[PDB]
Design a protein around this ligand. Structure first.
Ligand SMILES: Nc1ncnc2c1ncn2[C@@H]1O[C@H](COP(=O)(O)OP(=O)(O)OP(=O)(O)O)[C@@H](O)[C@H]1O
Ligand SMILES: Nc1ncnc2c1ncn2[C@@H]1O[C@H](COP(=O)(O)OP(=O)(O)OP(=O)(O)O)[C@@H](O)[C@H]1O
Ligand SMILES: [Mg+2]
Ligand SMILES: [Mg+2]
Lengths: 77, 222, 301, 303, 222
């Protein structure tokens, strides 16, 4: 019915959102540790960013699990 | 008295400086030991001063033996000997009054009578107008004059020296010889060695002679 | 009571000998001073840089994380718990909201939780042990990962063994340049003091054959060797004041740009007095060893 | 004559070695003093020449990153790689691709089981260029010409300590310039005091050969070889201590570089610099002996 | 060529040793000077050396004058004159072979005649037992006649010496002053200073007498 368009538009925006996130993960995931002890930043910063990139990646798995599980019931004719 | 028994010194270089000697020194006795050029009487004076090893034999000076004696105690014996040696022991670039005063700072005697005593010695040796100067500011006879001034001060019990006025004229030296029996008239022992024989023939005294380190070359002329 | 006049006579002769050719003795005063500024000048430099340690040569950080349910009183409970370990530096707790803010400004997006309606980010803690010796490598990381409520902790490029390799190179270079300079100091002084007194060797043997003692012959030369230490302790104090203020013209560029009030202390009076009396007692021991060789060279027995 | 000049040099040479063998405690004591002062300025200069070989770690921070858009093409990536290297104030420009960007996250904890949902890799390739010099303030003006490229997504610098790497560097260059002035001038005074005091020693032999004749070269000849053979003894005793010190500290640097994935350590010492070190000690004792004797000969000048 | 005229060395201290000397010495003549302790004659022989300036009058030594003497011309004059002096010192801790051979490297002679000139001059010294030893190994009497034998070697054109027989026997003195006419048989100058009037009243001596700088006190006495 009309519920099949309301999941595919949510699918393509989170594909855009994961593309921006993985691009933003490539910014603060490439800094070396000689940039630490330096630039007025505490060493817990620039080291917990990549482990926070784990946390945003794992949290969207259950969102992608919930979107994919309701698509299979919606595909029944 | 000083008993002078058998002693003989062998140097480690291989030469025997003296073979045998034995003398007899009484209290207040005067000696005039003089031999030939090989006679080691100035070495014997170095044996008297006990800064040389006795090697063989035995040497006796006073109530203490000369041998197996500690190094820390022997300059106390050297303080009461007015040693005059032919190489001239004076401190360069100092005042001349300190050169007399070399035993005077040792014995602990007061300061305002130091200047009286150093003024006292200089007419006895007949040396005026040379006070408060360097030892380089003197004549060649005058370091011998302040050298014998270093011996006559404090009236030492044992006076040991060799050959005064060896370069100085015998006109002045007859008074310089004439001082020495006045020191000997007091209760002092003078063992002066005078290498010359012509001037000493007038004085009646005891003469000894050594030849090639032997005990007696010529008999006593007492 | 003859000792007091003998000491005063030896001191006035030493100053009179020093005025004799004064260009030569002042030349020896400068050599005794400038080499003396090496192990004392490097001593204050290691006594200066321990005031700032958080932003220089120590930034050890471990990413120990909490569960999703976290209360802030449990975080400050664990902060004093890790302070019981002898090798830690800092112990602070970060919260849920401002940890979300700092990741957003780092990415520059600010759209972390506009999509998911619930918050999945755990409020975690910050364990920052910069005061470690770091030599235990990641085995120290494994011992500090032993928590019942921790999940996952990472350490890229292993980085405590790398912090060990920095600190092992730091300590061995300091101890390498400590022992070398003090053997440079103790041999330059010991050679120079001994080789003044080999000159004028005739003066010692004059008083020796007429008597004398070890106490009288030591007296003009004990005061001579100690006064060069007194001459060194003033001039090494002077050049240490000049070099520290000359370096002070460039440390204020780093201090103002970082943002701090970091001044360098120069010539303290407690250390300045101890620098002078260290050299004076150095000249006494070196002259005493020098005169004992001169007794043995012409010993009578 | 020339024959008398060579025999005067040869007899003064063999008397110096007989003098050197005499007093074996005293001759070896001043030999170590002549060496252990010289080991500091040449030793620290050998350290500074060895540290500057390691230049990749110092030129690793402040690397500029540029982000492409979603569409990826590698042939403009190599074009921007060679264009930055053509411009000055660079060392080398390197670019890793999206597959390299995919691969480097896979040993990491991120991007786990995410490419089954991803239709394509969205991570753009990046450039990473470090400037070869950090010069003075005003190096923040390179930002407007890196945005000149048609594909700029992020230019996320940390703007505060890029200028401040010009503060840490040249602080240490002035710090080592403080010690390379002070250690050289304390070398000239220790050598200049001991050799001059040797002329002040043994003073009695000068006037006994001057009044009977002699020149200034004949009296200086037993002291010139005395200054030279202690300088020759200085370079040998310097050589054993530096070889012991570089072997002692070589274990720490190979431990750091092996953890860093590099084959770096303390190198050896050259023979050409080894001969240059010893002839410096010979000439310093030779120059210092000439200035030492001129005070004593002027003291007893005929005038 | 050695004539003195109106010369005298003033001293900066309170005492000046010499007032006025004016004399001429003929070539090939044996000379003797004498005086008392205040008399100045060691400065008179040092005036011929002139290591300090006379600061008064004009003195002549051949073509080159002693007044306004330069450093670049003095050691040619010093190397042709062999002078020994009473303050006896020598190269400590060496042999006595090269101490005699000290001016021979200065003038420059080949090796096989160095050693035979040592033994040929040492036979009159009676030191065949000690030919190669330390200066401290020698006697205090022996080390003066080593320095006398230093003046004998390589035959200097001008000889000055010092006061001899400082520590030598009066018998063995007659052989050393017998040497000084043998070395003055050719054209040299001999200026032996002596004080014993008994041994210097034998043959032709000029016999200059000094008292406190007064040169004119005795005639030629020939
Ligand atoms: N260290 C020594 N080794 C070997 N022999 C020595 C040593 N010191 C001195 N002699 C020997 O001692 C001998 C003579 O000694 P001494 O000096 O006392 O005689 P003298 O005093 O000079 O007699 P005179 O004064 O009339 O000449 C010398 O021939 C010398 O060889
Ligand atoms: N530098 C000086 N300053 C002041 N006076 C001096 C100086 N040198 C010597 N005199 C004095 O001048 C005189 C010079 O005597 P001189 O040097 O010629 O010795 P001399 O002729 O051999 O006499 P003597 O027989 O006693 O040995 C001495 O009396 C001495 O006191
Ligand atoms: Mg004798
Ligand atoms: Mg004289």
């Amino acid at each position: 019915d009309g519920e099949k368009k309301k999941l595919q538009d949510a699918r393509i925006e989170q594909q855009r959102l994961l593309a921006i996130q993985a691009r933003a993960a490539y910014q603060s995931g490439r800094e070396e540790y000689l940039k630490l002890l330096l630039n007025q930043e505490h060493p817990e910063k620039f080291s917990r960013t990549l482990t926070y990139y784990d946390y945003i990646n794992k949290a969207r798995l259950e969102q992608l699990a919930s979107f994919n599980e309701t698509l299979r019931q919606l595909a029944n004719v | 008295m000083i008993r002078f028994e058998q002693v003989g010194k062998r140097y480690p270089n291989g030469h025997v400086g003296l073979h045998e000697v034995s003398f007899r020194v009484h209290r207040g006795e005067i000696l005039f030991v003089t031999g030939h050029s090989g006679a080691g009487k100035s070495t014997l004076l170095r044996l008297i001063l006990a800064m040389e090893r006795p090697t063989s034999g035995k040497l006796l000076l006073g109530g203490q033996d000369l041998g197996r004696i500690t190094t820390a105690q022997i300059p106390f014996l050297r303080r009461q000997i007015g040693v005059v040696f032919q190489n001239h022991q004076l401190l360069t670039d100092r005042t001349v009054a300190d050169n007399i005063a070399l035993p005077l700072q040792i014995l602990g005697m007061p300061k305002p009578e130091i200047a009286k005593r150093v003024a006292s010695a200089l007419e006895r040796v007949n040396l005026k107008e040379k006070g408060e100067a360097l030892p380089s500011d003197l004549s060649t006879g005058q370091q011998q004059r302040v050298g014998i001034a270093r011996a006559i001060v404090h009236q030492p019990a044992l006076l040991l020296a060799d050959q005064p006025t060896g370069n100085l004229d015998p006109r002045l030296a007859s008074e310089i010889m004439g001082v020495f029996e006045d020191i000997n008239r007091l209760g002092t022992t003078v063992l002066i060695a005078s290498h010359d024989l012509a001037l000493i023939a007038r004085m009646r005294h005891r003469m000894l002679t050594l030849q090639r380190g032997r005990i007696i070359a010529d008999r006593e002329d007492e | 009571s003859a000792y007091l006049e003998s000491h005063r006579a030896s001191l006035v002769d030493s100053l009179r000998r020093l005025f004799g050719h004064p260009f030569g003795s002042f030349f020896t005063c400068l050599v005794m001073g400038i080499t003396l500024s090496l192990p004392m000048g490097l001593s204050l430099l290691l006594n200066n840089v321990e005031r700032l340690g958080g932003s220089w040569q120590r930034a050890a950080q471990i990413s120990l994380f909490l569960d999703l349910k976290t209360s802030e009183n449990q975080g400050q409970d664990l902060r004093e718990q890790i302070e019981r370990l002898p090798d830690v530096i800092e112990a602070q707790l970060i919260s849920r909201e401002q940890a979300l803010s700092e990741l957003q400004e780092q990415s520059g997006l600010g759209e972390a939780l506009k999509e998911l309606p619930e918050n999945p980010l755990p409020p975690v803690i910050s364990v920052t042990p910069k005061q470690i010796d770091r030599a235990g490598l990641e085995a120290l990381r494994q011992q500090l990962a032993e928590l019942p409520h921790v999940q996952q902790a990472q350490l890229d490029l292993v980085w405590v063994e790398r912090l060990s390799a920095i600190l092992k190179l730091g300590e061995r270079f300091v101890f390498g340049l400590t022992i070398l300079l003090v053997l440079t100091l103790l041999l330059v002084v010991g050679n120079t003091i001994r080789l003044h007194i080999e000159n004028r060797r005739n003066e010692i043997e004059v008083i020796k054959l007429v008597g004398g003692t070890d106490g009288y012959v030591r007296r003009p030369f004990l005061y001579m060797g100690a006064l060069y230490g007194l001459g060194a302790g003033i001039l090494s104090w002077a050049l240490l004041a000049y070099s520290l203020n000359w370096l002070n013209g460039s440390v204020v560029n780093l201090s103002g740009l970082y943002g701090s009030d970091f001044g360098l202390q120069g010539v303290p009076l407690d250390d300045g007095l101890s620098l002078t009396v260290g050299a004076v007692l150095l000249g006494w021991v070196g002259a005493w060893l020098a005169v004992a060789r001169h007794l043995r060279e012409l010993a009578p027995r």
